């Protein structure tokens, strides 16, 4: 089981989630149980916290490929959190048993995926972009922003989620962005 | 698995490999598969490299406990490499599946054994001792050689074989034996 | 454009905010502001009918010299989903262990 599309819409409206079980022939009996959305402030080391931000039980729907693939498009205003100063943790719980003979380590009932809004970070990095042009000086701000982002990246991909929040709180908690206009705009 | 003996013969003509599978009650299904020899030129991190020095398959020799122990005496001059200035890397692999009661960490299918000729180091130590006999002063090159050997030993024991190759090529490559 | 308007408005609001906090701003940057909104009014007026696509290329590439030149003018951000190296999400699905006369096959 894996993530297909995990992002925050660039208009700062929608936390987009698109999770689907692996297509291998041992993953039939395994389904999707629920999706739990959690933030940096309510994070726990093991499993989702007992006070999550949003819960979504998949089985409360049509009852099989519809279960194996799920998509959410949560409006962030409804969650009452800032799209830019927030780091989301999306836990996906599986429902079923993978049939035997699968290699061990593939039968992980649960996955976690972290989400952040990179648009404010790119705004901050564009300020120091032009330092790359000038020679005779180290682009210190550009290097600093690159390392700041890469730190959260590696701490996420290594599973070191607590230090990931420490870096997030230190660096990017004060990120600002234009809040989405509740009245939708005409365009196409 | 493990190595019984792994050395170059005292006459500097054979490279002796003697491998055995460990004797625990949960390795009965584990046998020996192959022996691959690499030098400091062809060595790579992820397992034996392509175009190795010498590939050996154990099925060919024997016609089941026989395949749990293997011994070889490879004439180094047939390998077309210098017995004096070569660092052989001996990989061994296991064509088996251990039991389900194997303790965690003991199910390692591959092993590795580094080989050097100790004769040139012995002769170099003898030269340095002979120089020490005159005016009872220790050459700095002798302490340098000792500590460089200790550095290579640490590199081998910690698994950092490439920096051991750099030290070997840079410091101990020119050897007379 | 609808964006040169935004860039110019942001630039001058930053200009007058600086003149409010301090009592001075470099005239080498007031020059950049003058060029910027002169271009904005040039392209949003009766003289936009003289512009070819080559002229558009040149105008845009000359305006981006002003991008990170000062604190008033920033690099604009557009809504983009690309990158220099893309991700490959294609899946491999062979047919009953078959191959063609030279290579493998899928559905």
């Amino acid at each position: 089981m894996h993530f297909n599309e995990l992002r925050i819409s660039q208009d700062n409206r929608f936390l987009i989630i698109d999770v689907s079980v692996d297509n291998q022939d041992y993953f039939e009996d395994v389904l999707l149980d629920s999706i739990v959305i959690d933030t940096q402030d309510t994070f726990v080391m093991n499993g989702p916290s007992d006070n999550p931000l949003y819960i979504y039980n998949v089985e409360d729907a049509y009852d099989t490929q519809q279960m194996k693939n799920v998509r959410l498009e949560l409006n962030i205003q409804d969650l009452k959190v800032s799209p830019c100063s927030t780091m989301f943790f999306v836990y996906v719980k599986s429902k079923g048993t993978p049939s035997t003979d699968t290699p061990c380590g593939f039968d992980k009932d649960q996955i976690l995926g972290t989400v952040i809004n990179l648009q404010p970070i790119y705004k901050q990095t564009l300020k120091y972009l032009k330092e790359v042009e000038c020679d005779c000086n180290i682009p210190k701000g550009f290097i600093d922003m690159i390392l700041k982002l890469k730190a959260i990246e590696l701490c996420v991909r290594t599973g070191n989620y607590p230090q990931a929040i420490k870096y997030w709180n230190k660096f990017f908690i004060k990120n600002n962005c234009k809040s989405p206009t509740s009245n939708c705009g005409c365009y196409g | 698995m493990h190595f019984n003996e792994l050395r170059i013969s005292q006459d500097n003509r054979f490279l002796i490999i003697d491998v055995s599978v460990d004797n625990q009650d949960y390795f009965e299904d584990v046998l020996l598969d192959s022996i691959v020899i690499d030098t400091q030129d062809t060595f790579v991190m992820n397992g034996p490299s392509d175009n190795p020095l010498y590939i050996y398959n154990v099925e060919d020799a024997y016609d089941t406990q026989q395949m749990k122990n293997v011994r070889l005496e490879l004439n180094i001059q047939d390998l077309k490499v210098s017995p004096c200035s070569t660092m052989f890397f001996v990989y061994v692999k296991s064509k088996g599946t251990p039991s389900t009661d194997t303790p965690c960490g003991f199910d390692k299918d591959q092993i590795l054994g580094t080989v050097i000729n100790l004769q040139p180091i012995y002769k170099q130590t003898l030269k340095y001792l002979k120089e020490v006999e005159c005016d009872c002063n220790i050459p700095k090159g002798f302490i340098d050689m000792i500590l460089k050997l200790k550095a290579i030993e640490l590199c081998v024991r910690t698994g950092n074989y490439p920096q051991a190759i750099k030290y070997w090529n840079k410091f101990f490559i020119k050897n007379n034996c | 454009m609808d964006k040169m308007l935004e860039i110019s408005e942001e630039a001058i609001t930053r200009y007058f905010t600086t003149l409010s906090q301090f009592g001075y701003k470099k005239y080498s940057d007031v020059d950049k502001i003058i060029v910027l909104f002169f271009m904005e009014e040039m392209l949003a007026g009766e003289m936009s009918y003289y512009v070819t696509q080559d002229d558009y290329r040149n105008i845009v590439n000359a305006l981006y010299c002003l991008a990170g030149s000062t604190c008033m003018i920033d690099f604009p951000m557009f809504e983009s989903y690309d990158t220099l190296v893309h991700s490959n999400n294609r899946t491999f699905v062979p047919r009953i262990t078959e191959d063609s006369i030279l290579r493998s096959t899928e559905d």
Binding site: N23, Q24, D25, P103 | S34, V36, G47, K95 | T91, I96
Partner: peptide, 19 residues
């Protein structure tokens, strides 16, 4: 690398999971 036979069995096995 030096692939063992069982590894080739593993690779084909995992490719035919998506059979």
């Amino acid at each position: 690398m030096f692939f063992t036979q069982e590894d080739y069995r593993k690779i084909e096995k995992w490719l035919l999971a998506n059979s």
